[PDB]
Amino acid sequence: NPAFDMKQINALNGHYQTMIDNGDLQCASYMMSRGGEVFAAESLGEFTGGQKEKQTFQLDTIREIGALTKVFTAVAVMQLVEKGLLDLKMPVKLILPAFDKPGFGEIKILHLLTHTAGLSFELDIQKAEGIDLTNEEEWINYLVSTPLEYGVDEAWNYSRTGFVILGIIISKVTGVSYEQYVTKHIIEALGLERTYFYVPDTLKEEVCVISEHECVQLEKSHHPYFPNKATSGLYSSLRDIWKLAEMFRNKGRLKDKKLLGRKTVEAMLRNQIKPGLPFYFFGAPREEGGFGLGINLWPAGDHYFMTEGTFSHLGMGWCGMFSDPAEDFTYVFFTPISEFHPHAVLTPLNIVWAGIELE
């Protein structure tokens, strides 16, 4: 039915299981679908937050998704454009008057979504003496007192800061907090059953944590240094991340639940970066690739097995979602790990797409 070589599932399971046996992976889980129907899904290993003993990693285990939160923020911004409350070419200074100054006055909402606003990767918590970084009025003022790294449309520079600003813009346009809007108009509207900005207490023991810092953050009521959780901070499960990726592949709809129009998703999924722009990530330059309206179009094509047009997004954790529209294929995974290793996060993509068969 799904037209998938099941020998690659054994290769995928054996790949994750070997890393868990060698000690460079506590747990691992994945979920893949053809035509909107999951045909393979497995969870491996156990986890501990360093203060307990191991408990079984399951397919419905809740875990922080990190940068995947940016995809929720992107959907929320585009929902407000559909309503006529925002425009992508709006200068940020129109919404946040603290941006009406040299440098910041040229930043538009489009720049924030595409990481071309010239912002640094992140803001400083050390130089913020006596500043409440979780307070929105002070975090913005401290931001505009920091010089910009580039001018607008000068380079693709991945920035946690850009999407915190988007979360503030959402808050100022809708009259409610960023977390309230996303919860109402995305989480409950798409029907996500195990997705929370703050896990209820009856579910905290069901959250996969691999460090004490993750246990500490699980009990926290706010982000430790941001006025919102628009760049990171969402807890979710495989099934919910799969639904979000399927919503994009179906161009805004998931059966009876609709989050966006199909023309809006088509805009989100086409390359929005000017040609020739240099790409940077954490100060280090990376290979140039397509990037949409908060959605990554790289890696795809070239020497990768994913078809051109495959959209994706990764998150520190690690986790990721990859959907191939040409193959009607979607793959999401949880690989909880503290350090990054391409053999543990990127290599399984070769194993999965090598199993895709015709039809």
Ligand X SMILES: C[C@@H]1CCC/C=C/C=C\[C@H](O)C[C@@H](O)C/C=C/C=C/[C@@H](OC(=O)CCC(=O)O)C/C=C\C=C\C(=O)O1
Residues that bind ligand X (CB under 6 A): 66-67, 158, 160, 231-232, 281-282, 314-316, 340
- Record the tokens describing residue 118, joined without a space: 């010239």
Kindly tell me the burial class for residue 78, based on how many C-beta atoms sit within 10 Å of its own C-beta (0-12, 13-18, 19 or more): buried
Q: CB nearer to ligand X: give 40 or 133.
A: 133
State the minimum distance, in angstroms, from the CB of residue 157 to ligand X. Answer: 11
Nearer to ligand X, 2 or 233 (CB): 233
Cβ proximity to ligand X: between 204 and 251 the closer is 204
In a 13 Å sphere around the CA of 307, the CA atoms on its Cβ side amount to 11
CB of 223 to ligand X, least distance (A): 10
Q: State the nearest-atom distance from the C-beta of 342 to ligand X, in Å.
A: 8
Residue 344 CB neighbour total at 10 angstroms: 18
Nearer to ligand X, 31 or 319 (CB): 319
C-beta closer to ligand X: residue 9 or 166: 166
* Shortest Cβ 30–ligand X spacing (Å): 18
- Smallest distance from ligand X to CB 226, Å: 10
Q: How far apart are CA 158 and CA 289, in angstroms?
A: 13
* CA 45/CA 11 separation, integer angstroms: 16
Strand, coil or helix: 38: strand
Alpha-carbon gap, residue 270 to 293, rounded angstroms = 8
CB of 263 to ligand X, least distance (A): 26
| Residue 287: CB minimum distance to ligand X, A | 9
Least distance (Å) from ligand X to the CB of residue 211?
Answer: 12
74 vs 314, beta carbon nearer ligand X:
314
Name the minimum Å distance from CB 197 to ligand X.
Answer: 13
Nearest CB to ligand X, comparing residues 118 and 315: 315
User: How many CA atoms does the CB half-sphere of 54 hold within 13 Å?
Assistant: 10
Classify each residue of 36-69 as buried b or exposed e, where b means 16 or more C-beta atoms within 10 Å of its C-beta. Answer: eebebbebbbebebeeeeeeebeeebbbbbbbbb
* Contact residues for 201 (Cβ-Cβ < 8 A; gap 6+): none
Task: Give all strands (DSSP E) within the chain, no chain letters.
Answer: 27-34, 37-47, 55-56, 63-64, 156-157, 235-236, 253-254, 257-258, 279-281, 284-285, 311-315, 319-324, 329-334
Of 233, 231, 227, nearest to 143 by C-alpha is 227
DSSP character string of 135-163 = -HHHHHHHHHTS--SS-TTS-EE--HHHH
Residue closest to 71 by CA, chosen among 258, 265, 337, 326: 265
124 vs 282 by CB, closer to ligand X: 282
Task: Tell me whether residue 129 or residue 287 sits nearer to ligand X (CB atom).
Answer: 287
